[PDB]
Amino acid sequence: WGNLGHETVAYIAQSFVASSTESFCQNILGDDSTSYLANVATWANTYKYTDAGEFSKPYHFIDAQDNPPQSCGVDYDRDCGSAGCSISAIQNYTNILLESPNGSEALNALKFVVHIIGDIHQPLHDENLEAGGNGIDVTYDGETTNLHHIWDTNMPEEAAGGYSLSVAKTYADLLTERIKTGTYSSKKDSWTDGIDIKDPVSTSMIWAADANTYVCSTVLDDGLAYINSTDLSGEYYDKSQPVFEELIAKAGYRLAAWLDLIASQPS
Ligand SMILES: Nc1ccn([C@H]2C[C@H](O)[C@@H](CO)O2)c(=O)n1
Ligand SMILES: Nc1ccn([C@H]2C[C@H](O)[C@@H](CO)O2)c(=O)n1
Ligand SMILES: *[C@@H]1O[C@H](CO)[C@@H](O)[C@H](O)[C@H]1NC(C)=O
Ligand SMILES: *[C@@H]1O[C@H](CO)[C@@H](O)[C@H](O)[C@H]1NC(C)=O
Ligand SMILES: [Zn+2]
Ligand SMILES: [Zn+2]
Ligand SMILES: [Zn+2]
Known about the structure:
Layout: H1 3-16, H2 19-29, H3 43-48, H4 76-79, H5 86-99, H6 106-120, H7 129-133, E1 137-140, E2 143-146, H8 147-160, H9 165-180, H10 200-219, H11 224-229, H12 235-263
Helix pairs in contact: 1-6, 1-9, 1-12, 2-12, 5-6, 5-10, 6-12, 8-12, 9-12, 10-12
The chain binds 2'-deoxycytidine (DCZ) (2 copies), 2-acetamido-2-deoxy-beta-D-glucopyranose (2 copies) and zinc ion (3 copies).
One 2'-deoxycytidine (DCZ) binds near residues 2, 153, 157 and 163.
Cofactor: Zn(2+)
GO molecular function, one term: endonuclease activity
Function: Hydrolyzes only single-stranded DNA and RNA without apparent specificity for bases.
């Protein structure tokens, strides 16, 4: 996701974590504002463009070698690669937070988890084709961009009605209400099925597989000729919106569940 998506995911998580989980995170982050998760939700992106953080670029995605839009699937051994991926990074950073929650590595590990649980839920972060759709040129409301970018940024910003942190907070609260009492309330019990703090690979693979199904159903089902030749702010947007909204909601809810687990380990 772009900044709006990541900040939305983070504000949703802040709405669902336990009070002790909140304190646990605020201490690690050295940020006790009411935007504590949202303030750091883009850090991993910032960091990957620095000298020290270049190595972490591959941690934002898993390049699933599947066959969309006819068939989708993610396979950890097949797809992660020797440079690491979203799934191997969730393992590494979760385990840092379990083994050394007070240590010097906990700050970055937490910021990585917050960002990467978000990124896993963006379907094109679970797809090899043309570098997660970066290589696919599109027109969006008259602007030339690419397919990955519209999923990350153009479409969520359009749906949220902006890009600022305060817009993110309002979008988060909309989606949060959908979870508590609205259209997602009968789905959310299934959203933490299979979650296991002792098996970050399996757990994050559930989420990656889930987002990946949308590559076939939604992202690419019109086919590449349609996508090359049509302005995607029309019908493509209209059918994309409910999918990215639900996936952002899931990302937030799952991030909160995972943070609760990490924060509750005895010591
Ligand atoms: N194989 C790839 C390559 C890049 N990206 C993401 C991370 C990059 O910062 C962004 C570029 O728009 O897309 C992706 O998800 N999959
Ligand atoms: N994430 C972003 C960043 C910028 N802009 C647009 C609106 C801003 O006014 C302009 C900045 O030059 O670009 C946008 O819509 N989304
Ligand atoms: C785990 O995280 C640390 C700190 O960013 C990094 O040095 C290391 O290479 C990572 N290990 C794996 C296996 O991803
Ligand atoms: C997109 O259009 C360009 C130029 O019209 C052409 O080179 C290319 O083959 C097209 N790609 C697809 C998948 O239609
Ligand atoms: Zn992102
Ligand atoms: Zn992206
Ligand atoms: Zn990222």
